[PDB]
Design a binder for this molecule. Structure first.
Ligand SMILES: Nc1ccccc1OCc1ccccc1
Ligand SMILES: *[C@@H]1O[C@H](CO)[C@@H](O)[C@H](O)[C@H]1NC(C)=O
Length: 342
């Protein structure tokens, strides 16, 4: 169980103006800190956000949040469930801003909703420094789905925040799970929704990526293969046949030739975008998310599991014999890897 803390600065808020927060379980014998960003799609205009407020309200408000949450997967404290970081300080940051963690705009007489994802992350970091984060050696910013894209947009800002506050010895790193998407052609007839959302949210993207693509084109920085080369912090990417990617591509699974080629080309393109990413784990499976699932230990690429690959990453940041960090499947069809989830 991680315990809820609502933010002391009550001007940093969920969509509806209620306080944002975080769930914490401390481990005083450890200098490692794991901050996990929840996902859950997004909303991009007044009518679409009103719909979400009716039937997905925990993703827009803290009013009904429980006082505790169970840590699962990489957030478990049990070595059998979490071979990687079972002894770490654990933080779960709920997603209540509907802005893929990019916003910095308050509720006002002009704005029915507040979109403060980027500021929520900053304020969680700032309040944690008083509860032990000041003594950390490593801060791992992790996240799944919209939270995985949120890692890519925020990891370098966290590094900058800690340097300017006077903690230059804390090593900031990122782990982006199921947040690496392609702006490809649909199978039957996305970038428009992000382009509209960014204006609706006052969304912010990393500075080097913003300077490459310039005004009006910041939406490009929500796509992993375009924003990742601009990042300075070390980032491990977990992603080949992602179900959210296929949903936006209008693919629903006796497969004819046209769809067979479409699916095989998608896997080849994903593989291509990861060729020059040295810390990555990309199995040939149809699935979505992995790192907070209890059975995240079962899947393997080339004989190496995800917890092992992350441990090898840690060792590399002190090539390694028998402990690889770049693991991408080469076979071309979903589930050609025998260890894919059932
Ligand atoms: N909405 C969004 C949010 C984050 C990153 C990209 C995004 O574009 C939409 C999208 C395109 C392809 C596959 C999945 C989603
Ligand atoms: C509370 O958060 C807001 C938004 O980031 C900021 O303007 C303000 O400085 C914060 N308050 C304090 C006391 O730090």
């Amino acid at each position: 169980d991680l315990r809820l803390h609502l933010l002391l600065n009550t001007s940093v808020t969920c969509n509806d103006g209620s306080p944002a927060g975080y769930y914490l379980k401390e481990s005083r014998g450890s200098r490692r800190w794991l901050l996990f960003l929840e996902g859950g799609w997004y909303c991009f205009n007044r009518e679409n956000c009103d719909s979400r407020y009716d039937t997905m309200r925990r993703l827009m408000s803290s009013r009904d949040w429980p006082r505790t949450r169970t840590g699962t997967g990489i957030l478990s404290s049990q070595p059998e469930e979490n071979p990687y970081w079972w002894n770490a300080n654990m933080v779960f940051i709920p997603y209540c801003s509907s802005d893929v963690w990019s916003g910095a705009s308050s509720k006002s007489e002009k704005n029915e909703y507040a979109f403060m994802g980027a500021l929520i992350i900053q304020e969680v970091v700032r309040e944690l420094l008083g509860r032990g984060l000041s003594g950390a050696k490593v801060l791992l910013l992790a996240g799944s789905s919209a939270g995985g894209t949120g890692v890519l947009l925020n990891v370098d800002r966290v590094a900058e925040q800690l340097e300017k506050l006077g903690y230059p010895a804390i090593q900031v790193r990122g782990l982006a799970d199921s947040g690496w998407f392609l702006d490809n052609k649909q199978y039957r007839h996305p970038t428009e929704a992000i382009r509209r959302g960014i204006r609706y949210w006052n969304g912010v993207v990393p500075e080097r990526c913003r300077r490459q693509f310039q005004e009006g084109e910041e939406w490009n920085c929500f796509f992993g293969y375009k924003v990742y080369p601009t990042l300075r912090s070390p980032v491990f990417v977990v992603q080949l046949f992602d179900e959210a990617q296929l949903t936006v591509d209008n693919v629903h699974l006796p497969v004819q030739e046209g769809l067979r080629l479409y699916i095989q080309n998608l896997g080849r393109e994903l593989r291509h975008t990861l060729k020059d990413v040295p810390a990555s784990f990309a199995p040939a499976c149809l699935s979505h998310e992995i790192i907070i699932r209890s059975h995240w230990t079962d899947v393997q690429v080339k004989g190496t599991s995800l917890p092992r690959a992350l441990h090898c990453w840690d060792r590399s940041l002190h090539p390694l014999k028998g402990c690889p960090v770049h693991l991408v499947d080469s076979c071309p069809w979903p589930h050609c890897n025998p260890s894919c989830p059932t």
